[PDB]
């Protein structure tokens, strides 16, 4: 395949043109996003039951919905969570391989079977099935300071939202806020003045605000002679607050007509009143633009910003827009980094080729054949249906090194032949290709073998490995192809003959460098001859080095992905149980004035009455958004340092409640998180106090008796708060004339909201809700003095029936797989790994009698399955590499000479990581580098490069010995021949990965991890192999 194309340069150029065109057409049809989708399909229900507690909501809605979901094909597990706010969710997680759309369609079809059995209110509001997965893109914020949050929410929903949905690439826009509604604030004192009731208001509003369908004149079964037809029209709906206030509640025989304004006050309000957002202290209304699968992120951000700048000319006075956070600047920075590394790699390879080969027409072949390799890689990526994302671009950055090593190898061999034998370019190229073609094919096979297993993993880490695996493997295959077709023809046609005796005559810097490198090579071959002289000593030294490397490797922490400074910090306020929204707002204002002081924080968003750890009136959370990294270049100006400073200030000044700032993980869905999440269930429905007692007994068993860093272990629910319970004595309630329908009516009307009807508000329908005035809803006496009408119409005090009283109760419920559950957390301190810790906790839960079980949660479900897949895949890859090398060398013994250079790279990488951790623990803050995904990728890369170098050395030494030399002579001459290209490749690749070694800014955590691994692996492994591979060959040939 090489001699065919050395004689057909135009044919080679045509195939490269086709590859270039395919790569460009692939680049132009690839979705651009920040991350791929790694989490598994999840669907949620989100029912609404206003006024219901955790127990009522759960038992009457969520359990009923959930016990109809077993059997939805693909169900992994199932969860349920209700709180005291009137909203609950069922969350079904499906196994991978499942279709999110078919899953959601099946969940909806199952819900339809039981929708009738739920309460009438839950049916009025409706249950909303939806997929959890989100492709978040941007956040929009409208701040006014002059108009309420209701007017801003309405303006947004009517004018700004329906125009962002229309932009190309937008897959969904969500407005965070309650819509408008006609609110009626009844006064019970005035109601009892006239002897009316809440049912009167509800029925009157439902009877006087109704839609009329009149019909038509001249309908189809008509009389002979009808000439005209016409649709009749009537308007029976109310539209304003005055018309609603004019509703008639009772028409007297006298004609007085008491109205709805007599007993209430009617105005436009909101639906819930629960949450309240603020940006830097001023009111805001936020949206959430989300990208669509197969959409470009940068184009969509640009279009959204332009559309908003156009719309801003019609904003009311005082309003303004702002996009504080945007997840397209990440992929934009990644693309810019790819381009910059490509250009600097071109410069480095130019410098190296000119310094060593000492001519300019040598530095034009790599410049031509590397971009074509990357373009073919882009083409393959596009074919397989992937996207352009942070991980794909890191893969390109990594593969650039191998793709330049290929060209360096080929051109250096050709130039060596041309200079040593004074041959023309065609003959020299033919000879060089005859020498290196089989080796190139074998190297490509070995690289494919070692990169395949990265794509055959399972879980979310499997999806993260697939990116690197596929990108790098495709790029490497295309590089090998281009090395066998286009590089030989380019060398044959561009290179010029070297006059016999041309070299050794240079008079300048070039002659000095030539002499210097000649002396260095002589010294190197002398040292390798010495190393080969004594074999047992060097072999025992090698065994020691390999065992020490394995040791340093095993004694290395584990992780998934390091936390990165993505620009923002999250905050979670929490007040004592029973607090109100006013104290929470005061505490949030304190937090805002604190975050204003920190000069690294630019914006701060504040949300009240909501938190990821439950939703309650005494909860809240903020979002501190930091400046651009360009301004945050200092010791204490990264995300973690800002989090620490903010937590310190909070603990210092916060009067009511506490708050903690944290830097979230990179992958929000399935990203590295720490801890052994647990879900303690009870199979026998023993109760809540019993399950709580068992949870506390387990926490006690774990805290001190076990080995779990007793500080970290914690309960993960929501502490019980005092409640107000009303026993109803049915015996005494029946001694008098009080029934049980009126008791329920009074109790449910005194304190909760009521959805009665809808009305048309300037184009769109909205809800009409009745509820008491605030002054009748505040003290516990507003429920104890609730008189109920007996059978004779008269009122009766509810103290003679109920006997209200205080008690401590649960403010949150949770089910897991159909059983009441209670979450727990923990972490093994050090030296104990997750395996034996989880076995210990399982035995602990076993100690607790039957009726109580442990179910793993979150990432522990992935960590529960043994890590045997990794070992199996790596052993199979090693066997495949051995088989390929045996096919290449035609021996069963020689492959052992190349399989002995894996310990070297492993030792190098592990020692570099450990040394960086020491050097940054002595002078730095904390050990930041561990054995994570990026370590695995960089280690596989260094292993591939070292295997390539060793393959070439061994294949050169095997041919020389065949010519009639010894084994020592063959190894010596092979080392002396391979010395220069190894040095060139090492120089280039190491100086290219150096910019990853000091990465600072966007995503520099993974960049620093991979840079450290690759740098130290390459350096140490090369320094060792350069001397040991000849020895491996010698001992493997003398042993057999």
């Amino acid at each position: 395949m090489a001699k065919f194309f050395i004689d057909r340069p135009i044919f080679a150029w045509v195939i490269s043109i086709f590859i270039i065109a395919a790569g460009i057409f692939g680049i132009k049809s690839l979705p651009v996003s920040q991350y791929p989708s790694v989490a598994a399909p999840t669907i949620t229900l989100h029912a609404i039951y206003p006024g219901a507690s955790a127990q009522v909501m759960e038992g009457s809605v969520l359990s009923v919905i959930e016990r109809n979901m077993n059997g939805v094909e693909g169900l992994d597990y199932m969860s349920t969570s209700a709180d005291s706010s009137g909203s609950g969710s069922v969350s079904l997680t499906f196994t991978p391989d499942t279709d999110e759309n078919l899953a959601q369609v099946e969940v909806q079809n199952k819900l339809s079977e039981v929708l009738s059995t739920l309460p009438a209110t839950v049916q009025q509001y409706g249950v909303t099935v939806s997929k959890a997965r989100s492709n978040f893109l941007m956040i929009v914020m409208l701040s006014s300071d002059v108009q309420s949050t209701e007017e801003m929410n309405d303006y947004a929903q009517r004018n700004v939202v329906p125009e962002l949905q229309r932009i190309e690439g937008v897959g969904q826009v969500r407005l965070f806020g309650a819509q408008r509604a006609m609110r009626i604030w009844v006064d019970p004192k005035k109601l009892q003045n006239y002897n009316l009731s809440f049912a009167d208001v509800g029925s009157a509003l439902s009877a006087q605000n109704i839609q009329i369908s009149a019909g038509s004149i001249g309908s189809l079964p008509a009389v002979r002679g009808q000439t005209v037809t016409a649709t009749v029209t009537a308007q029976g709906q109310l539209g304003t607050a005055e018309e609603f206030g004019n509703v008639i509640l009772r028409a007297n025989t006298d004609g007085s007509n008491i109205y709805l304004k007599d007993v209430a006050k009617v105005g436009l309000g909101m639906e819930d009143y629960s949450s309240s957002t603020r940006l830097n202290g001023v009111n805001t209304t936020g949206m959430a633009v989300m990208l669509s699968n197969s959409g470009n992120a940068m184009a969509t951000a640009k279009a959204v910003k332009e559309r908003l700048a156009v719309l801003e000319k019609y904003f009311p006075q005082g309003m303004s827009w702002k996009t504080p956070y945007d997840t397209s600047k990440f992929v934009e920075i990644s693309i810019e980094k790819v381009i910059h590394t490509l250009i600097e790699a071109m410069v480095l390879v130019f410098v190296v080729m000119y310094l060593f080969l000492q001519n300019i027409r040598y530095t034009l072949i790599p410049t031509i054949v590397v971009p074509i390799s990357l373009l073919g890689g882009f083409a393959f990526i596009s074919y397989m249906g992937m996207s352009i994302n942070v991980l794909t671009m890191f893969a390109m950055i990594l593969v650039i090194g191998i793709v330049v090593d290929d060209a360096i190898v080929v051109v250096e061999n050709v130039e060596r032949i041309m200079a040593g034998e004074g041959l023309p370019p065609k003959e020299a190229t033919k000879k060089a290709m005859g020498q290196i073609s089989g080796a190139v094919i074998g190297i490509t096979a070995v690289l494919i073998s070692v990169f395949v297993p990265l794509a055959m993993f399972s879980g979310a880490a499997g999806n993260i490995y697939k990116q690197f695996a596929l990108t790098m493997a495709s790029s490497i295959a295309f590089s090998a192809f281009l090395a066998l077709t286009l590089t030989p023809a380019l060398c044959a046609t561009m290179l010029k003959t070297i006059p016999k005796g041309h070299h050794e005559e240079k008079k300048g810097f070039f002659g000095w460098f030539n002499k210097k490198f000649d002396s260095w090579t002589h010294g190197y071959e002398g040292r390798v001859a010495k190393v080969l002289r004594k074999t047992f000593r060097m072999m025992v030294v090698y065994i020691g080095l390999a065992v020490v490397g394995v040791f340093l490797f095993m004694r290395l922490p584990t992780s998934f992905l390091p936390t990165e400074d993505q620009g923002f910090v999250m905050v979670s306020v929490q007040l004592p149980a029973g607090a109100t929204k006013e104290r929470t707002d005061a505490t949030l204002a304190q937090v805002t004035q604190l975050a204003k002081s920190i000069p690294e924080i630019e914006n701060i968003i504040t949300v009240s009455g909501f938190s990821f750890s439950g939703s309650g009136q005494n909860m809240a959370m903020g979002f501190a958004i930091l400046k651009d990294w360009n301004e945050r270049t200092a010791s204490g100006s990264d995300a973690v340092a800002v989090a620490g400073k903010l937590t310190g200030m909070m603990m210092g000044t916060l009067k009511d409640g506490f708050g903690i700032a944290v830097v979230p993980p990179p992958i929000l869905e399935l990203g590295n998180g720490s801890g052994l999440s647990i879900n303690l269930q009870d199979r026998n429905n023993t109760g809540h106090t019993a399950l709580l007692a068992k949870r506390n007994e387990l926490i006690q068993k774990m805290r001190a008796s076990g080995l779990f860093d007793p500080s970290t272990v914690r309960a993960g629910g929501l502490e019980d708060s005092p409640q107000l319970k009303i026993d109803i004595n049915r015996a005494a309630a029946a001694a008098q004339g009080v029934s049980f329908a009126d008791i329920r009516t009074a109790l449910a009307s005194a304190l909760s909201s009521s959805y009665v009807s809808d009305f048309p508000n300037q184009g769109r329908l909205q809800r009409v809700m009745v509820q008491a005035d605030g002054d009748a809803r505040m003290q516990p006496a507003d429920i104890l003095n609730l008189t109920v009408p007996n059978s004779s119409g008269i009122a009766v005090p509810l103290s003679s029936i109920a006997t209200v009283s205080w008690q401590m109760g649960t403010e949150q419920s949770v089910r897991f797989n159909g059983y009441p559950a209670m979450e727990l957390s923990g972490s093994p301190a050090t030296g104990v790994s997750t395996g034996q810790a989880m076995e210990a906790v399982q035995k602990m839960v076993d100690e607790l009698g039957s009726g109580y079980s442990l179910e793993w949660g979150g990432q522990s479900r992935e960590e529960a399955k043994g890590g045997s897949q990794t070992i199996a895949l790596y052993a199979l890859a090693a066997v495949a590499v051995f088989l390929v090398l045996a096919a290449l060398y035609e021996s069963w013994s020689i492959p052992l000479a190349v399989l002995l250079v894996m310990p070297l790279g492993l030792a190098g990488a592990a020692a570099g990581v450990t040394g960086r951790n020491l050097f940054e623990g002595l002078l730095g803050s904390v050990p930041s580098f561990a054995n994570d995904i990026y370590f695995q990728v960089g280690f596989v890369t260094v292993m591939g490069l070292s295997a390539k170098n060793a393959i070439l050395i061994i294949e050169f030494a095997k041919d020389l010995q065949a010519q009639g030399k010894s084994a020592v002579e063959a190894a010596l001459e092979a080392a002396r021949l391979r010395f220069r290209p190894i040095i060139m490749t090492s120089f280039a690749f190491i100086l290219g990965v150096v910019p990853l070694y000091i990465a600072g800014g966007a995503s520099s955590a993974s960049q620093r991890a991979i840079g450290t691994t690759v740098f130290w692996g390459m350096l140490i492994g090369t320094l060792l192999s350069v001397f040991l591979v000849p020895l491996f060959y010698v001992v493997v040939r003398k042993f057999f």
């Binding site: 956040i139 969500r174 965070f176 949450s275 957002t277 936020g286 959430a288 968003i605 949300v607």
Partner: peptide, 9 residues
């Protein structure tokens, strides 16, 4: 960043 969904914000 309100109404049940936090958002990266």
């Amino acid at each position: 960043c309100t109404n049940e969904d936090g958002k990266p914000c």
